[PDB]
Design a protein around this ligand. Sequence first.
Ligand SMILES: *[C@@H]1O[C@H](CO)[C@@H](O[C@@H]2O[C@H](CO)[C@@H](O[C@@H]3O[C@H](CO)[C@@H](O)[C@H](O[C@H]4O[C@H](CO)[C@@H](O)[C@H](O)[C@@H]4O[C@H]4O[C@H](CO)[C@@H](O)[C@H](O)[C@@H]4O)[C@@H]3O)[C@H](O)[C@H]2NC(C)=O)[C@H](O)[C@H]1NC(C)=O
Ligand SMILES: *[C@@H]1O[C@H](CO)[C@@H](O[C@@H]2O[C@H](CO)[C@@H](O)[C@H](O)[C@H]2NC(C)=O)[C@H](O)[C@H]1NC(C)=O
Ligand SMILES: *[C@@H]1O[C@H](CO)[C@@H](O)[C@H](O)[C@H]1NC(C)=O
Ligand SMILES: *[C@@H]1O[C@H](CO)[C@@H](O)[C@H](O)[C@H]1NC(C)=O
Ligand SMILES: *[C@@H]1O[C@H](CO)[C@@H](O)[C@H](O)[C@H]1NC(C)=O
Ligand SMILES: *[C@@H]1O[C@H](CO)[C@@H](O)[C@H](O)[C@H]1NC(C)=O
Ligand SMILES: *[C@@H]1O[C@H](CO)[C@@H](O)[C@H](O)[C@H]1NC(C)=O
Ligand SMILES: *[C@@H]1O[C@H](CO)[C@@H](O)[C@H](O)[C@H]1NC(C)=O
Ligand SMILES: *[C@@H]1O[C@H](CO)[C@@H](O)[C@H](O)[C@H]1NC(C)=O
Ligand SMILES: *[C@@H]1O[C@H](CO)[C@@H](O)[C@H](O)[C@H]1NC(C)=O
Ligand SMILES: *[C@@H]1O[C@H](CO)[C@@H](O)[C@H](O)[C@H]1NC(C)=O
Ligand SMILES: *[C@@H]1O[C@H](CO)[C@@H](O)[C@H](O)[C@H]1NC(C)=O
Ligand SMILES: *[C@@H]1O[C@H](CO)[C@@H](O)[C@H](O)[C@H]1NC(C)=O
Lengths: 569, 107
Amino acid sequence: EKLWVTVYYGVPVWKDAETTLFCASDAKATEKHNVWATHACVPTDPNPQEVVLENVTEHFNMWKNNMVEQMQTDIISLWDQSLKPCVKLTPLCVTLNCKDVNATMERGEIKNCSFNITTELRDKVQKVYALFYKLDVVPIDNNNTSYRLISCDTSVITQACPKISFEPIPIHYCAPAGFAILKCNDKTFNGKGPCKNVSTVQCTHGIRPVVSTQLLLNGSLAEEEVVIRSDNFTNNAKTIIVQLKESVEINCTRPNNYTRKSIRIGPGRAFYTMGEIIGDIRQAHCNISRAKWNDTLKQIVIKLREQFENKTIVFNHSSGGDPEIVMHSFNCGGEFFYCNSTQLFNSTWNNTEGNTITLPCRIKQIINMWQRVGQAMYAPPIRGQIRCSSNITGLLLTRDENGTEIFRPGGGDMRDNWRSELYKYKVVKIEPLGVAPTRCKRRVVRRGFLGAAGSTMGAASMTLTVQARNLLSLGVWGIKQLQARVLAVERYLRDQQLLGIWGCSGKLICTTAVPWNASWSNKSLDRIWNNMTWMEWEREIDNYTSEIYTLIEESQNQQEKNEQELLCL
Amino acid sequence: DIQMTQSPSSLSASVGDTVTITCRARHGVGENLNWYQQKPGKAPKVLIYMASSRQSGIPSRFRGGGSGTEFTLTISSLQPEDFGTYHCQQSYSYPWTFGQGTKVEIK
Ligand SMILES: *[C@@H]1O[C@H](CO)[C@@H](O[C@@H]2O[C@H](CO)[C@@H](O[C@@H]3O[C@H](CO)[C@@H](O)[C@H](O[C@H]4O[C@H](CO)[C@@H](O)[C@H](O)[C@@H]4O[C@H]4O[C@H](CO)[C@@H](O)[C@H](O)[C@@H]4O)[C@@H]3O)[C@H](O)[C@H]2NC(C)=O)[C@H](O)[C@H]1NC(C)=O
Ligand SMILES: *[C@@H]1O[C@H](CO)[C@@H](O[C@@H]2O[C@H](CO)[C@@H](O)[C@H](O)[C@H]2NC(C)=O)[C@H](O)[C@H]1NC(C)=O
Ligand SMILES: *[C@@H]1O[C@H](CO)[C@@H](O)[C@H](O)[C@H]1NC(C)=O
Ligand SMILES: *[C@@H]1O[C@H](CO)[C@@H](O)[C@H](O)[C@H]1NC(C)=O
Ligand SMILES: *[C@@H]1O[C@H](CO)[C@@H](O)[C@H](O)[C@H]1NC(C)=O
Ligand SMILES: *[C@@H]1O[C@H](CO)[C@@H](O)[C@H](O)[C@H]1NC(C)=O
Ligand SMILES: *[C@@H]1O[C@H](CO)[C@@H](O)[C@H](O)[C@H]1NC(C)=O
Ligand SMILES: *[C@@H]1O[C@H](CO)[C@@H](O)[C@H](O)[C@H]1NC(C)=O
Ligand SMILES: *[C@@H]1O[C@H](CO)[C@@H](O)[C@H](O)[C@H]1NC(C)=O
Ligand SMILES: *[C@@H]1O[C@H](CO)[C@@H](O)[C@H](O)[C@H]1NC(C)=O
Ligand SMILES: *[C@@H]1O[C@H](CO)[C@@H](O)[C@H](O)[C@H]1NC(C)=O
Ligand SMILES: *[C@@H]1O[C@H](CO)[C@@H](O)[C@H](O)[C@H]1NC(C)=O
Ligand SMILES: *[C@@H]1O[C@H](CO)[C@@H](O)[C@H](O)[C@H]1NC(C)=O
């Protein structure tokens, strides 16, 4: 009837945690000088593992998921790293003498600006000229032809190196050894609350770091239905992330060809700008099929009506303002497109001509990307006819009164784009050690990693090896990789130190001399071993764990080592 | 003028194998050696910039490297499209001389 404390190593118990994740990529995807620096990532395994966790129900919350903040930090750091070794355009903030370029044709969209550049290399003022887009130049001196480059007065404009490619490459996030990523496989998972089909992975699927607003491009689609997710959902000031069941093909283009010229700024540095227009002048535009969008809104309205009760749903255009935040935007082809998008949110559904909707689009070169102040990027001209043909896989909506709800395209920060892909992933910390009562005094079928997590303590106890055989074993990715290795090493040694002191360094099941105190858990062994999982037990014992550890080392290894020291005689 | 040589002066290989062309300088040039591919009757195009930096649009099959006076161009998984004469050029110091070139025949 006497129960004794026994130590287990490899317990399939995890706790919520925030950790540094490292990147992985498909080594056979693979260009260098890509802004995402995917060549510095660890090659992925052809075998993704993926262990389904039977009997495990887990609570996922996309709105507090540290992986999204970590991804945003990595994306911004990668952009700053890539742009850092490039030409600054500080000498280019000069008065511009601009005249309209005469010519769906454009009407005054491209300006022919002549200005004089002061150059360090030789005391030399040269009268050069270049073409700019209307959105790139801010008028000064009232009705005079004087202009300045946009955002010069508020930021330092950095020219993007022409060799830098912006093509998104899928990025895989991988937990450091000692941690794991849980994936929610529920077909209609709403982004918050319990998930029934939970699997354990070391690395996530590839996420394309596509930067856009209002509409989510590429990424991934829902499997059964359109899913509308929010946090409070009642609160109008919360972004609604809509994941589509079927993609909509959107074909954006910049029909003009142009040429490119290089105006030297200083030794080894030049401004890359637009030259003579080759061909005619045609407005950039984007063609999206009407019928597919119509059905997409039909599905979205059905789900919005279900969650907002049987109210009238109306889609409106975003409020006017800075084109970078009130228009759809993307970086397809290496050029940056800003499209009106009004034709897509200009209808009442409640409860007729043209096969294709053509959205006017405008090209901008000086971009205050990431909603920052003090920094800006100048994208050099591509000089080519940009055929995009990208997939729309989701929308970002916001909400604003006679029984009618008004929705607008929009969103908050870029994080909303990444939640759409990270909604199913959670990062957890594995603590493979635990204690339990047994009948033994010291008296001196395999599922994969954490596959027994939803099993009872019994049956789970024979798979401790599966966890024991796991755990352990100068840019953004290099430092994060270094931090991940150091963290995994520190955790492995903490576990090994604890096992070393207790007297259990070589065992997965270790028996101690400490009796079980009924005040910790007044339950029979069958009530424990054949009813509870290891996680429920750990939560129950979480208030006495430090007491048990204090007793085990104190009474079992500083006394066994003294009794043995005395018994030799 | 820095004199350039190249070896072998005549190369042949079958489709799918891997070949190496070595460009040699009388004097060191750091990493400043470019590689070009010339099709018969056409002007050459550059394949590799500063010894190892590949031009966009050229598949990863074209690799290269080296420093000082001995540099290599490695062509993995040789294709019929790789037939032609390869050249190497030094950008370290003026004049930017070239090697004699290596003729690559595909069998
Ligand atoms: C979402 O997904 C869709 C579907 O895949 C994405 O669409 C792809 O977009 C890419 C980007 O443009 C496009 O790839 C180009 O295809 C062209 C086909 O003619 C190629 O000519 C072009 O190659 C040039 O650019 C590459 C990237 O810089 C270089 O690696 C390559 O060597 C070429 O470089 C030449 O041109 C550049 C111009 O910048 C110049 O600097 C170089 O010196 C050189 O002259 C690309 O490979 C795909 O074809 C698109 N796919 C489809 C099916 O249409 C879409 O982009 C994604 N959405 C978003 C928002 O990004
Ligand atoms: C924009 O302005 C420049 C002036 O800087 C134009 O240049 C002139 O072009 C005409 C023919 O079109 C030539 O005869 C002149 O010699 C040019 N003068 C220069 C370079 O100083 C240029 O043509 C215009 N470009 C566009 C696209 O409108
Ligand atoms: C600079 O350019 C302006 C027009 O842009 C012209 O009026 C002026 O004379 C020029 N000055 C010099 C010193 O080149
Ligand atoms: C549960 O998740 C696994 C992950 O491998 C998947 O294969 C399976 O189809 C999912 N089943 C359900 C019912 O969601
Ligand atoms: C875009 O959608 C088409 C639909 O046929 C699909 O074949 C293609 O792979 C998708 N592309 C991307 C990048 O998701
Ligand atoms: C949700 O929004 C409503 C707005 O009416 C507010 O009263 C409520 O407190 C919010 N709840 C949460 C959990 O954010
Ligand atoms: C751009 O060049 C292409 C080359 O095929 C041409 O067809 C097209 O018409 C040109 N664009 C304009 C606006 O003239
Ligand atoms: C878009 O549709 C219009 C319809 O007139 C057509 O003329 C144009 O060529 C289309 N553009 C693309 C890029 O397919
Ligand atoms: C986009 O272009 C492709 C070219 O293959 C075409 O098949 C598709 O129908 C186009 N989509 C739209 C919406 O115009
Ligand atoms: C799209 O839906 C609207 C709903 O008012 C309808 O009037 C319109 O005719 C539909 N268009 C197509 C192409 O199905
Ligand atoms: C919003 O939608 C309503 C629908 O009746 C429309 O009248 C109104 O002009 C739209 N825009 C704004 C800014 O209210
Ligand atoms: C989009 O086009 C409509 C056309 O009437 C215009 O009124 C609206 O201001 C445009 N939107 C933006 C953001 O420029
Ligand atoms: C929005 O819908 C109304 C319906 O009368 C139409 O007149 C208007 O032109 C539409 N907006 C755009 C930008 O086409």
